[PDB]
Each structure stands twice: as C-alpha cells, then as structure tokens.
Symmetry: C2
Amino acid sequence: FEQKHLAVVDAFFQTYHVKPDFIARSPGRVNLIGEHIDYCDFSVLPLAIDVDMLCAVKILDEKNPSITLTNADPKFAQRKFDLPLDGSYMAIDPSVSEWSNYFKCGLHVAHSYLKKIAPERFNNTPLVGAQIFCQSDIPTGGGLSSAFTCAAALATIRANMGKNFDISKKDLTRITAVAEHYVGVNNGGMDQATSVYGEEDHALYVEFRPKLKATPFKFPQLKNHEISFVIANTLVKSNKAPTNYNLRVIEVTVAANALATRYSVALPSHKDNSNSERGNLRDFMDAYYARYENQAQPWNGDIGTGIERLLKMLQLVEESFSRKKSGFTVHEASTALNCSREEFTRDYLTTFPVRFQVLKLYQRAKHVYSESLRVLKALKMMTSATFHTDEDFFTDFGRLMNESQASCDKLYECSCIETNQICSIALANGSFGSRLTGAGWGGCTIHLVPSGANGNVEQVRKALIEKFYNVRYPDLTDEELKDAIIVSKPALGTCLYEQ
Amino acid sequence: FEQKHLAVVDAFFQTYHVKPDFIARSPGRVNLIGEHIDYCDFSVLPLAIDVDMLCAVKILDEKNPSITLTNADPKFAQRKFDLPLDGSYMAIDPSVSEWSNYFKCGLHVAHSYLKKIAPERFNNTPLVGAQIFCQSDIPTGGGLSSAFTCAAALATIRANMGKNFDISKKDLTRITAVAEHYVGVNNGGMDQATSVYGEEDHALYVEFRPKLKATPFKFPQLKNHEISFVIANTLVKSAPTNYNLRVIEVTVAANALATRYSVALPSHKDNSNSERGNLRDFMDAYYARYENQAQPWNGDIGTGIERLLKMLQLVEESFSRKKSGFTVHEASTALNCSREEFTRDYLTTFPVRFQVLKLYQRAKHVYSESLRVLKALKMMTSATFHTDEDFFTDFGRLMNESQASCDKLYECSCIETNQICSIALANGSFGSRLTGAGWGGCTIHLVPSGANGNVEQVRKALIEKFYNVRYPDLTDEELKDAIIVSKPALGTCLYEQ
C-alpha cells in the first residue's frame, strides 16, 4: 500500500539520480456483477482494486523535449523518444505489443485535452519533457491497459499544467475512455471510469445511458468481518471465435428484434451514448414500456424502476421464447422477425464470421435481463437491506454472484472447465460467491471471501493452489503463481502524490 | 488425374468390399482478381481449380440407415453415424472441429432441400444409408470446406432421388451457400458458387448484387501457349488492426463520401454483403443524384468501368489531401457528427486498434480493385491479342497492380507474400498477387504452361529462394502441398459407375 509508493520513489531515484516531482497512480479494476450485458447498454458493477500502475515523474526543462520511460520489471526495456517540435501528436502504431504503448495513449489523450483548454500554449508547442519510472503489480485480467493510460494521462496533465491545476473525474474519464480505440478493447469506457472513480469500501454503478457515468456505492458496515475479493485467473487466455462473442452479439440483437416484432414496437434510434450501433435489449425494454405502460419514460437507472421493468422483461421472455429453448434456425428466426431469409442473412450474417446451428434467443435474452437485474439486486443489498449477522451479508451477496455464474455458464455459455473448477474449489473452501469476470471463455474469476483474522482468504488461496494450479499447471513459477491469485478490497481511483 | 477415379473406386472396394454406385466430385477454388471488395458488395473473379473432393458412394438399403465415411488419408479416422429415425437433422456441433463436419453440412442442406420438394417422402423419415470413401487433394487455401460441402450435398441428392434427377446449379449454389454459418466462414456464397459453376478454361464473374450469381468467362484461346496458375502458400496462417479495422475504414469512407456530396446511402432491397450502406451504395447514390441515372448499377461491365473510374476521381477530390489518415475527431467532422455519435455508430461492438482511419487508401483500393475485375473481364472477351505475350503481359499487369494495391493501399500483404511475388515475377511469372483473406495465406501467379511454359522455372525459384530459406525444416510432403499448379476446372459433377 504505502510501502509500494516509497519503493517507486526510491527506484526512480536509483534510476535517474534525482527526486521525482510527483507520482501519478491509477488502480486496476475487476467486474463484480454484470457480465455480457454492457453491449446491450445495461449497467454493470465493477470496483477498483488494490493493484495499480505507479508513474514517478521528474519534469524536465529542455530545448528539445524528450521522455524517458523506465519500468521496474526487467523484461520491459527502457524507452526514450523526442516529442514533436511542431506540437503534433506522437506517432503510435498498435501493430506492436510494446509496453510503452499505453503510456503513449495517455500522453496523447492528455495532449488533445490540453490543446482544447489552452490552445495558445499547446497547439504549436511540444509538451514538457520528463523522466518517468513505471511500476505496476496489475496481473493479467486486472486492467493494466486502462490503469496505465489513466496514470499517464494524469501525469501529463500535472506535468504541463502544474500542481494547482485540477481535472475533474468526469473529464479525466471522458478523455481516457477514447483510448479504447488505441488499445483494441471494447468495454465502452467502463475500465477507465472504474480506475478514475474508484473509492475505498465502494463498488461503482457504471452506466452507459444516456452517458458513460459512474456512481460509488458503499458496502455495508460489518460487525467483525472485512469484505475482500479473491481474484483467480484460469490462465486460459480470454482474448483468444465464430461460436463465441460474434455469435452472442448476433443472438442478442436478433432477440431484441424478435421481441420488438412480437409486441409490435419500434426500436427508437439512439439519440445519446450507446454500446451498440443498432437497437438492443434495453431499447426494447424502453419501447415496450412507452407503448404498453402509458407513455412510461425510458429507464434512467433508478433501482426500483429497473427491478420492476426487468422482472417484466423476463416475463415477456418466458411468453415469447420459452417454447423454443432448442433455439431458432435461420428460417425460424426470419419468421420471428417477419422478414425473408435474404433479409435476415443480409442484416445479421454478413460482416463477421459466425458458427451455429441455432440461435438461442431464449437463453441469451434471459441471461442479459436476469444479469442486469442482479446488478440492481446487488445495489439494493449493499444499501437498504438488513443483515442480522455478517454471515447473512456474505451468504446473500455471494448467492447473487453464484446465480450470475450459473447464468453466464448455462444460459450464455461463456464459461469453461477451468472457470467451473476454480469456482467449485473456492466455494468448497471459504468462498461465499464465485463467478467468472471479464470477457468470458477463460480469463479471471472473482470470489467473495471474508478477510482478516476470522476470514477465509488463506483457506481459499491454499485450496486453489493445491487443487487447481498445482494440478493443471505444475510448472508455474512462484512469480506466475503470485500473479494468478490476488486478494483485494475496493480501492481508491486515479490520483497524484506530490513529492 | 483421371487415374484419380480409378484409384478412388479401387480404394473404395478395398474398404467396403463392394463397387461404389457413383462418384460425386467438387473442385477447390481460388480468387484471381478482387480481394477485399466483396463486403463492399463488389464482384469478384475466382476460378475452380484442378484439385477436388471425390466422394465414392455405395447406396445402402437398410432398416436402420447409417452412413460410413472413410477417408483416403489414414490420419482421418473412419466415422460412422446412424441417421435420425424421426427424419431429424444430424448433430453438427459448432465447437468440435473434425474432418467429417463438411460432409454433415452438405448432408444437412441436401436433406432440407429434399424435405421441401417431397415432404411426405423425407419429413419424418431418415435419408438412405451409404458407404462413402472421401478423397481430396485440395491444400490449405484451396477451399476444401466448400468443395466437400458441395460434393456431399450432391452425393446426398443423388443417393435419395435417383440417377435421372439433377438439381439445378442454381439451387445447389443456393442451398450450399447457407452452410457458411455452419462452418464459420463468411465469403457471401462465393466459394460454393465457384465450386458449382466452374468450367474448364473459364473464370467466373461472381456477383452479389442484386443476387449471388456466377457467370463463366472464357480465357482467350492462345496460339502456342497454355494458361496456368501457380498457387503458392506463404505458410503464414491468415485482428483489431486488420479485418475489423478495414470494415470500419470502408464503412466510414462511404459515409464521408455520402456526407461530402450530400447524398443518402440507399437501403438494400436485395442481396448484400454488408449490413450498412457501403462503397457500392455510395456509387449508386452519387449517380442517382448527379448523373440522372436513378437506377443502381446492375453489374454491366462497360457501365461499371465508367462508374468506377468516376468514383476514383471523387476519392482524389475528397481524400487526396488527407493521406495521413483521419483521427476519430477528424472522422466525426467529415461525417458532420459528434465524437460520441461517431464512436457509437462506428466503434462499438468490434475491437479495433488505430491511430488514424485511412479513408483515402482504403476507398482507393476498393474502387480500383473492383475496377480491375471488370478490366480483366473486358480484356478476356476482347480480340486484340496479336501475340500470346500480349495477353500474359497485360493480364499479368492487372494482377501486379492488384498486388500493389493490396500491399500499399490496403496494407493486407505481408513480407512472405511480398517475397514470394518478387521471386515469381523475376523467374517466369507474368503477374503475382496474394489471394484469400490476406495477412498471410496463399498467392497466385500467371504462368504459361506446357512444353514452352515457365511452370518449372517458377516452382524451382520458389522452392530454392523462398521455402528452403524461410522454412528449412519443411518435409517433402509439406513442401509439396505448399505449391500446386492448376488450370481452370469443371464445377461440381457426378460420375456414374
């Protein structure tokens, strides 16, 4: 925690032989509830975690500004580059796995912000030079790309505007979320918003309509436990199909349109932000309410209205699709959309490769609406629910995580054997709730585990090491094993520490 | 080569101890001109090739119908499955990838077709059983999936409908094109169309607008040379910086053009390889608005050459000062929308990595490459070749111009591709380019064949100067599969025994 902050200052001094002017820090992130619903515009529940990227910076006074980047990790070699004298953006090429790319993204988005607020200073002049020491303990799955981008953007703003300049969380989130198109990631700004808005003891309600937005919600005060989460990687690379993500995108879009057709409503064009180009399952929920519930206004994120309308949606899903759980062939789907096979193929099967015999409209729609509902039930538990013992909190919240896992697996089919093994082991050995998190088909898992003296952290971690990692991956080094399992409480978002 | 049929029938007998009833055959395919333009609805120029899937079949009369599939390759283990007694379709699981998948695809699409023509005959009754020996010499990049699917569909029609009934090429192409979503391939039916409609000495003008359609075009008869093509694999397996980025770039380019010229992109009323308005749609919108040709381009070649030349002028007028590419901010401005709306509409569901969108280069590629297809067809049908070298040169130049476009404008070549082509042209090839998905995969080279041909000159050059260097530890079998030679081939057909 504070130990880490000193280590980075001290290593900066070893490297550059001068005290740094400041440190910029930004935390990793993980999603606690709400998987595979963001591209239907539904809100998710992430948290910032206590692994981070730390960037110690000395600001330079140079005729020709340059930036030097050194990393604590020996495998990431030192980088040095000159800032363009004309004030133009640095050249970045994302056809490389270069460790400094994320810094360059941050530098870039900060630069364009600075050009906006102070044109006469930054339009035709380079930014200031710097010596930078970077140190991260964020493992795979913990969102290094957004943390580094955010720390780098704040460091650039601080270096060029001085310590008495403040950028709001709202602006820092907006400008860094643009970096998704430099990184090759599509979480709609959720990663950046979490790294920026994180607070200790809080998860974030992250929304996308009408705008990317984050609202902190504080976990209940417990009598004598602490809330922690164990995050365990399957070590199956999620990033690595026509049967997976592309297929899901088609299925939920077809589902939204099958519902729209069945209930005779149109999906209104997006007038604001959206994580989809076309009408989606949230749009259907709004269109349905507007027509059948007396000009009901579109859902704008309050918990009570959300719960009521999502429960209604699950009813419409039973009514519309429950007699077709074996899925829809292209022919049956065309009929459900009141269009020809040619129209269907044109609209849904053209751009991206997909592989399927049937489209599982029942399952995919049921997942999205029920998973979106669990986000709201989680919020309700955190805020207004009463628990007569700490155990009741862990049991009820954990049960939502388990119900989420069961849905992701059985309804969305985005789990894998490694995920299920880890979850089962964790639950038999101290976890109250266990689920995949992230892109699915591999990647990370997250576990609700009481921490402290009366907690289960070491019990869960020991069982996972012995029953999963030692079995499936005998040759992992100590370092790899350390990265594979981390323990975290909710953490504070992007910030500066003056030095 | 026609010893194939003998050696397939013999192998069948060695497996099932009985003579087969018929052989169903479907050729592999390759694209000759027209890379990365099909998803903008532009037409391509493929050909069926001298490698094929052969399915020797004995039709079985059984109480409980079963299909046995045996392969000529011993590493593909025999498969046997009973046919669903409720007339249900087989289980084509999408996750498991095994060699019999393409067969089940063909079986499925043929079965569905049969149910529609004779419901009382096929609806709740299984198809007839069979013993089947499958022999393919199609290499990677050659389109085994479509060949095997088409051969299997035809084998299934034949076994169930008798020797006299012949499915139209039209219907066979229609029903097999559907199988793309069972395989996980999205070539808009081009593969199936090529495999079905191939003819000796012909390439195919394969159109997608307003419908999937294939029209054979004969190569010019030459005096003392023969037309052949060397197909050489880079052995690099065919990304947010690649295909995804290209789809976004061409979609944004069409809208920047539509915005610049104040037109709306016409909706799709028939077939299309894109969900949204594309570069072909802009061509139709521009013509309806400024050239009083309210009618969308119908695929006519002369007209097409005219309109594509026009589009290229507009690309220069609209984008030539922005070869640096467009930032997201600049792209939003060119579309007259906010960054939020640009991001929502163009950057949402599929991952991409870019600093700029290269609207000039990508639009220039798609229109110029589509134009090269038409020029190829025009060149093929015109009688202006006084010498054979006139043809090999002029056609080769179109191929070379295409390769340069793919490489520099679309940036979908790779070093292995570029090396292979450079070697080929300096050693007997008249024209050399990548073919297929790009960023690896196969390459195709126009090479005169026969007594006074350069086939062996090119092949030796590639083996000694590319493969032996880059891939020293290639076995003779691998090194053999990497390079094949073909002339245009006949499409799907049956041989009664």
